Each structure stands twice: as structure tokens, then as C-alpha cells.
Amino acid sequence: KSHQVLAQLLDTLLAIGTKLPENQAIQMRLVDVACKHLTDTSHGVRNKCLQLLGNLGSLDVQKIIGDYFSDQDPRVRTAAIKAMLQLHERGLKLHQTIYNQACKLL
Amino acid sequence: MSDIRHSLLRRDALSAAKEVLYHLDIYFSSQLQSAPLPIVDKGPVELLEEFVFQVPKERSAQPKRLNSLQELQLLEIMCNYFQEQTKDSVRQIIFSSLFSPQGNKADDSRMSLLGKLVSMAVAVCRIPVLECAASWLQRTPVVYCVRLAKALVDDYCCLVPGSIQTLKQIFSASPRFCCQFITSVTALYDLSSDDLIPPMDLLEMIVTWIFEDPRLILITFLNTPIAANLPIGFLELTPLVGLIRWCVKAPLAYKRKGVGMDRDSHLLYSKLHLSVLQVLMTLQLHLTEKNLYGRLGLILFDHMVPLVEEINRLADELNPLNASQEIELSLDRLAQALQVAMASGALLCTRDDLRTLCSRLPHNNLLQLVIS
Amino acid sequence: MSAQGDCEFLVQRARELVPQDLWAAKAWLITARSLYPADFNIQYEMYTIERNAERTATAGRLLYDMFVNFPDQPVVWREISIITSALRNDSQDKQTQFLRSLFETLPGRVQCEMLLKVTEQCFNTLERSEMLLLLLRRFPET
């Protein structure tokens, strides 16, 4: 229930996922549950969910992360942009549609 | 008619062609119902020559107006009239002189004008002209019709970049013309020059034909029985064996005697040959239970023998080392086409006709296995 | 002509060059007489098992003839039945949707007819219950 414990558990889940990157089904479960808790009112929970989506993700996820470029909390917006950047660094080819969304954030 | 041609030639500013079309329609109103096939009437031939080729009934006569721009306007007006004439007589009279002989002193200029007018009419969506074009090769000379169709296709695609898609759209809308263009394509695919190798636009047109023109081929096959070595032109759109043999042997025959275009396009030529073979097999499957008749069996009419001879001519000089695979592929494709044609039940001989024809074919393991 | 063994050898050779020479595949799989049905085991099935539009029609018409001649290919029906239970999730993901479509690409009636053989021999309680439910859903009065 609590937000600090939920965020810390999401951190733990991120650690477990990074410990097993070769495992695919585990990462799909992890991104699914990150998407599930992505609507929490706590900015920390959304930050950790976006970090999970950035470090772990099929390469849909860009749209899910892209939706949170309009989040009211600025640090959630930074977390979403960093998640997209980390997705790109992992090898994902981002869409041109991200350009207009990022242009508004400047 | 010289007098009618002279009377209709006046007022070239969009009025001469209209008057000529009206006179031709009045003259051939009964002809539109009696026999509106792709034939050239000698009465309106002079009018067509005068109002389009700028040449009256006399070959050395004074041209209609100053020609060029006036001639172009007359051609446009005549095309508009023929497309909206709602009768095959006018379009046939205008265009049929291009390849079907008319026995006239000015028949060459009339033929050039008819070819230009037929190209315009095909581009102006004159369905009756394109539909009659299929019937043009049914009884008139096939070499001249193939040459005219090839010239029109080259003008549409080779000379005009990007207009090939419009030609493919017209062929889809006029499947009779698309089916009649298969013989012209086969004649123009002798692999004796760079233009003989189909381009990317030609490949797209071939794909469009395989998707749609096969229905026209089936309709034509249902219209009349599949004859073996018909008079001077059947236009059955079944030159699959010769086209496959030419395309597969293009990197071999072309290299033997341009060569680089066919040699570098080996993958593209193989893909086109495979698509043509698939289309032919689909057509044979469709025309298998249908009354496609026997006797002929495979659609060769001695063209398979000419293709085998052409392959064998180049199979002895420079082929055995440089392009043995191409010759083997051509022989295998011809034998596979013959076998698949016999798979439709038309060829009622497992090895009788094969011994009659395929015995003289070149040496190939796949072809020998398919034959036997 | 009539050399059925030669026809089978030609079919095998075409299968060997199937990834490159697709024309011989069509010419051999559709070659009537001789060892035609004998060659319609991996040549026609390759088109039937393809992920393209061929599986929409070839599998629903050519595989039925093979099943009538020899009903020994129940793997497809079992795989479709297994995938059906797991296809109700990850709809947004492309891989799950692609797998579900590949499983269900065959006609429903043809799939039920093919799986009726497994249904009769469904010794497993779960398999028998699933088969009975599928039969009831396809035909309530069956």
C-alpha cells in the first residue's frame, strides 16, 4: 500500500531484471507490472516504473513512455525522457513522433 | 474517301476531327453492329489519315492546316469523340490501320497516325479501342501488332518516366489489352538488346498482369478452343515457356552476344521467371477442369522448339563455364512449364508428345527428370 | 512422364533449392500423375505451413486431402488449442498477436474437423473437457 515501499520494491524488481537480461519472459512480466503501477499518484512510483520501462522493454513502450511527457510532475517528465534515452542507448530505434513531444518540453 | 476526307479536314481548331468522327459514325453506324472488330474501313481511312497524319488520300497531298499544333488538336478531338462515341466502329477505323494492313498508298502515314491515336485512346481510357485490340491479333498479322504494342509500351514506360503505372492501371481496367500485350512482351523479350530485359516498371506491369490479366486469359480460353498453331495470330496470352526460357537464359544468351544489364539482373530475371511460372501454373489450374481441349496440350505452338534452339545455340559457346547454371535453369523452366501444362489434363500423353518435342531439347538433369 | 521415383527425386531436388528456386516448387507440387500425392507431403505442406497468405487457403483445402488420405498430422490442431488458452493476453504486444494469428490462421471449421481426431482420443481429463467445450461452442446440438 505505502508509496515508499512500493517504489523500493520497484527498485528491487529493476535490480532483479537487470540481473537477468537474457531472460525474456521475466522482463515481459516486469514491464507488465511496471505498466500496472504506472498510474500511481506518487511521483516516485511513476519514476521507478518509467526506469523499469527504460531499462527493460521490447525492441508500444515508446508510446507508453511518451504519454508521460505531459505529466504534471516535472521529475516524472525527466524520468520519462531519460527512459526514452536509455531505450535508445539499448539499441531501440525511436520514432520521429518523439521529436514534436520533446520540442514542447524545451 | 478522298472527298469526305477533304470536306472533313477543314476547320482544324477542334472542328475538323469532330466532323470526321461524325461522318465516320454516319457511314459505319450499321458497321458498329454488323462486325465492330478491330478492322480498318477504307472509306474512313482517308479521313483518319487526313485529320491525324496530315496526309490526305494522296500520299503527297497538302497536309491538313499547318499540322503540328493543329494536328495535335485534331488528334485530341478525335480521341475525345472516339472515347465518347460508345461504338467500336469509330475507334476500330481510327486505330486498326496501325498494324493491320489496309493496302493503301498512304498506309504508312495512316499506320503511324493510327498508332499514335491508339496510344492516346488507351491513355484516354477508350475502353472499346483497348478491348478491340485483343481481337486485332486474332485475325490480322501478329508481328505488326506485337511491334505496335511494344512501341506503345516503350513510349509509355521507357520514353515517359513514371507513366508506366498509368499503363498498368489501364491494363487492369482493360484486361483484353493486357492479355493481348503478352505476345508483344514475349516478342520484345528476345534478350537481343538491353531494352529486351524488362525494367522495374516492366516487372511491376508483369506482376499486375499476373494478378489480373490471368482472368482475361481464362476468359479468352473459354471464348474459343485452344488451337494448336493458329493461323497468323491467336493472342491467347500463353507465351509462358518462351518468356521463361528467354528470361532465365538472359544472363547467358545476352552475355554470349546489353549483356551487363541481363547479367547483373540475374536475381531479378529469376524472380520474374518464377512469377511468370506461378501465374502460368495458376492459369493452368483454373483451366484444368474447364473445356480447354487436348491435342496441343502445352501452350507452345512450336515456340518451345524455337526457345530450345535459341538456348542450344548459345549453350555451346561460353555457356558451359560462365553461365551453365542459366542454361540449365532455362531448360528446367521450359520442361517444368511443359509438365505443369500436362498436369492440367490438356496434354493427354505422358511421353508421346514429350518424345516428339522434348527429345531434341538440350541436356539438363532437371529437364530430363521432368520429361521422364 | 510416368517415372514416379524420378518425380519424387525431382520433388526432393526442388525442395533442396526451394529457398531460391520457387518456380520448381510450384511446378513439382502441382505435377499431376506419377508420385504426385507422394510428393504432396513436404512441397504442398511448405506452402500450407508458410506464414504468408498461402496458409489461409492452401492449409484449408490441401491439408484436408492429406488428412483424408492419411490422418496422422494432429500437431497443428494441438498447437492451436494450446495457443488458444494463452492468446487472451498481451494483445498489445506484436509477438503474442502474431503467434495467436499463426495458430488461428486456419479455418475454424477445418480446425475443428482436424482436432476431432484428437478429441476422440483425448484421454486427458483437461484435454477431453477442452475438446467437449470446443465441440459444444462450434455446434451446440452436436
Short mmCIF file of all heavy atoms in Angstrom, two decimals, chain B residues 281 336 339-340 343 370, chain C residues 7-15 22-33 35-40 43-44, unseen atoms left out:
data_model
loop_
_atom_site.label_atom_id
_atom_site.label_comp_id
_atom_site.label_asym_id
_atom_site.label_seq_id
_atom_site.Cartn_x
_atom_site.Cartn_y
_atom_site.Cartn_z
N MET B 281 1.07 -21.54 -63.97
CA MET B 281 0.56 -22.70 -63.25
C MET B 281 -0.83 -22.43 -62.68
O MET B 281 -1.69 -23.31 -62.71
CB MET B 281 1.53 -23.09 -62.13
N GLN B 336 9.58 -27.76 -66.96
CA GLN B 336 8.62 -27.63 -65.87
C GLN B 336 7.31 -27.02 -66.35
O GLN B 336 6.23 -27.42 -65.91
CB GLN B 336 9.23 -26.78 -64.75
N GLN B 339 5.52 -29.77 -68.18
CA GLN B 339 4.96 -30.75 -67.26
C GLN B 339 3.74 -30.20 -66.53
O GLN B 339 2.74 -30.91 -66.36
CB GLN B 339 6.02 -31.19 -66.25
N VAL B 340 3.81 -28.95 -66.07
CA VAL B 340 2.69 -28.34 -65.35
C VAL B 340 1.50 -28.15 -66.28
O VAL B 340 0.34 -28.25 -65.85
CB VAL B 340 3.13 -27.00 -64.72
N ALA B 343 -0.12 -31.30 -66.45
CA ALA B 343 -0.79 -31.58 -65.19
C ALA B 343 -2.23 -31.10 -65.17
O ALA B 343 -3.01 -31.56 -64.32
CB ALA B 343 -0.01 -30.95 -64.03
N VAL B 370 12.13 -34.32 -65.39
CA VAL B 370 10.76 -33.85 -65.56
C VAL B 370 10.11 -34.50 -66.78
O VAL B 370 8.94 -34.90 -66.74
CB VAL B 370 10.72 -32.32 -65.64
N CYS C 7 9.98 -38.63 -60.40
CA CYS C 7 9.17 -37.50 -59.96
C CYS C 7 9.45 -37.16 -58.50
O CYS C 7 9.55 -35.98 -58.14
CB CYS C 7 7.68 -37.80 -60.17
N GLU C 8 9.56 -38.18 -57.65
CA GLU C 8 9.89 -37.95 -56.24
C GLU C 8 11.29 -37.36 -56.10
O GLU C 8 11.51 -36.48 -55.26
CB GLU C 8 9.78 -39.26 -55.46
N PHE C 9 12.25 -37.84 -56.90
CA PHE C 9 13.60 -37.29 -56.87
C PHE C 9 13.61 -35.82 -57.30
O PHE C 9 14.31 -35.00 -56.70
CB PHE C 9 14.52 -38.11 -57.76
N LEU C 10 12.84 -35.49 -58.34
CA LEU C 10 12.73 -34.11 -58.79
C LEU C 10 12.08 -33.23 -57.72
O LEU C 10 12.48 -32.08 -57.53
CB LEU C 10 11.94 -34.04 -60.10
N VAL C 11 11.06 -33.76 -57.04
CA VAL C 11 10.41 -33.02 -55.96
C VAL C 11 11.39 -32.76 -54.82
O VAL C 11 11.43 -31.66 -54.26
CB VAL C 11 9.17 -33.79 -55.46
N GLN C 12 12.19 -33.77 -54.47
CA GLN C 12 13.20 -33.60 -53.42
C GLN C 12 14.25 -32.58 -53.83
O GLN C 12 14.69 -31.76 -53.00
CB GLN C 12 13.85 -34.94 -53.09
N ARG C 13 14.68 -32.62 -55.09
CA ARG C 13 15.66 -31.65 -55.59
C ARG C 13 15.10 -30.24 -55.55
O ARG C 13 15.81 -29.29 -55.21
CB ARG C 13 16.09 -32.03 -57.01
N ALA C 14 13.83 -30.08 -55.95
CA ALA C 14 13.17 -28.78 -55.87
C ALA C 14 13.07 -28.30 -54.42
O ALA C 14 13.22 -27.11 -54.15
CB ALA C 14 11.78 -28.85 -56.51
N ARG C 15 12.78 -29.22 -53.49
CA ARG C 15 12.76 -28.88 -52.07
C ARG C 15 14.13 -28.42 -51.59
O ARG C 15 14.23 -27.55 -50.72
CB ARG C 15 12.27 -30.08 -51.26
N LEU C 22 11.88 -20.97 -56.46
CA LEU C 22 10.49 -21.21 -56.10
C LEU C 22 9.64 -21.70 -57.27
O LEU C 22 8.57 -22.26 -57.04
CB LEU C 22 9.87 -19.94 -55.52
N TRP C 23 10.08 -21.47 -58.51
CA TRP C 23 9.31 -21.91 -59.68
C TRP C 23 9.21 -23.43 -59.74
O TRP C 23 8.14 -23.98 -60.04
CB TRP C 23 9.94 -21.36 -60.96
N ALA C 24 10.33 -24.12 -59.46
CA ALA C 24 10.29 -25.58 -59.47
C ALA C 24 9.40 -26.13 -58.36
O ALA C 24 8.84 -27.22 -58.51
CB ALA C 24 11.70 -26.15 -59.34
N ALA C 25 9.26 -25.39 -57.25
CA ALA C 25 8.41 -25.84 -56.16
C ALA C 25 6.96 -25.92 -56.63
O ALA C 25 6.26 -26.92 -56.39
CB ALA C 25 8.54 -24.91 -54.96
N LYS C 26 6.50 -24.87 -57.30
CA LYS C 26 5.14 -24.82 -57.83
C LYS C 26 4.95 -25.85 -58.94
O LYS C 26 3.89 -26.47 -59.05
CB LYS C 26 4.81 -23.42 -58.33
N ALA C 27 5.97 -26.02 -59.79
CA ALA C 27 5.86 -26.96 -60.90
C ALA C 27 5.87 -28.41 -60.44
O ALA C 27 5.25 -29.26 -61.09
CB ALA C 27 7.00 -26.72 -61.89
N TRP C 28 6.54 -28.71 -59.33
CA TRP C 28 6.62 -30.06 -58.79
C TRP C 28 5.45 -30.41 -57.89
O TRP C 28 4.89 -31.51 -58.00
CB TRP C 28 7.94 -30.24 -58.03
N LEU C 29 5.08 -29.52 -56.97
CA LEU C 29 3.93 -29.77 -56.10
C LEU C 29 2.62 -29.85 -56.87
O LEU C 29 1.68 -30.52 -56.42
CB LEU C 29 3.84 -28.69 -55.02
N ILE C 30 2.54 -29.20 -58.02
CA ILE C 30 1.34 -29.25 -58.85
C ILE C 30 1.53 -30.17 -60.06
O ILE C 30 0.79 -30.07 -61.03
CB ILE C 30 0.90 -27.84 -59.29
N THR C 31 2.51 -31.06 -60.01
CA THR C 31 2.75 -32.02 -61.09
C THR C 31 1.83 -33.22 -60.91
O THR C 31 2.00 -34.00 -59.97
CB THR C 31 4.21 -32.45 -61.11
N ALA C 32 0.87 -33.38 -61.82
CA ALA C 32 -0.10 -34.47 -61.74
C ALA C 32 0.52 -35.77 -62.23
O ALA C 32 1.56 -35.78 -62.89
CB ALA C 32 -1.35 -34.14 -62.55
N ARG C 33 -0.11 -36.89 -61.83
CA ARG C 33 0.28 -38.26 -62.14
C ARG C 33 1.63 -38.61 -61.51
O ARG C 33 2.25 -37.76 -60.86
CB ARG C 33 0.32 -38.52 -63.66
N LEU C 35 4.33 -39.98 -58.89
CA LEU C 35 4.34 -39.82 -57.44
C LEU C 35 3.99 -38.38 -57.06
O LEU C 35 4.77 -37.64 -56.45
CB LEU C 35 5.69 -40.24 -56.86
N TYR C 36 2.78 -37.98 -57.46
CA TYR C 36 2.19 -36.68 -57.17
C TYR C 36 1.75 -36.60 -55.72
O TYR C 36 2.20 -35.72 -54.98
CB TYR C 36 1.00 -36.42 -58.09
N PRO C 37 0.84 -37.48 -55.29
CA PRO C 37 0.44 -37.50 -53.87
C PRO C 37 1.59 -37.78 -52.93
O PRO C 37 1.60 -37.27 -51.80
CB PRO C 37 -0.63 -38.60 -53.82
N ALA C 38 2.55 -38.62 -53.34
CA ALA C 38 3.72 -38.89 -52.52
C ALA C 38 4.57 -37.64 -52.35
O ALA C 38 5.16 -37.41 -51.29
CB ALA C 38 4.54 -40.02 -53.13
N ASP C 39 4.65 -36.81 -53.40
CA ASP C 39 5.37 -35.54 -53.31
C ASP C 39 4.56 -34.45 -52.63
O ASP C 39 5.12 -33.39 -52.33
CB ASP C 39 5.79 -35.08 -54.71
N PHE C 40 3.27 -34.66 -52.40
CA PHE C 40 2.43 -33.67 -51.72
C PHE C 40 2.43 -33.90 -50.21
O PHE C 40 1.39 -33.96 -49.56
CB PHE C 40 1.02 -33.71 -52.28
N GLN C 43 6.20 -30.59 -50.12
CA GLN C 43 6.13 -29.49 -51.09
C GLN C 43 4.88 -28.64 -50.89
O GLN C 43 4.96 -27.42 -50.72
CB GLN C 43 6.19 -30.05 -52.51
N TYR C 44 3.70 -29.28 -50.93
CA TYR C 44 2.45 -28.57 -50.66
C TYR C 44 2.36 -28.11 -49.21
O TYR C 44 1.83 -27.03 -48.93
CB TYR C 44 1.26 -29.46 -51.03
#
